[PDB]
Swiss-Prot record:
Superkingdom assignment: Eukaryota
Name of the protein this chain belongs to: Magainin-2
Annotated source species: Xenopus laevis (African clawed frog)
Lineage: Eukaryota, Metazoa, Chordata, Craniata, Vertebrata
Length: 20
């Protein structure tokens, strides 16, 4: 089940993940 292709600004977001 994977339906969420509606965002492209998660790039820099993935960087905040490396911070936590």
């Amino acid at each position: 089940k994977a339906k969420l292709f509606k965002k492209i600004g998660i790039g820099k977001f993935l960087h905040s993940a490396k911070k936590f």
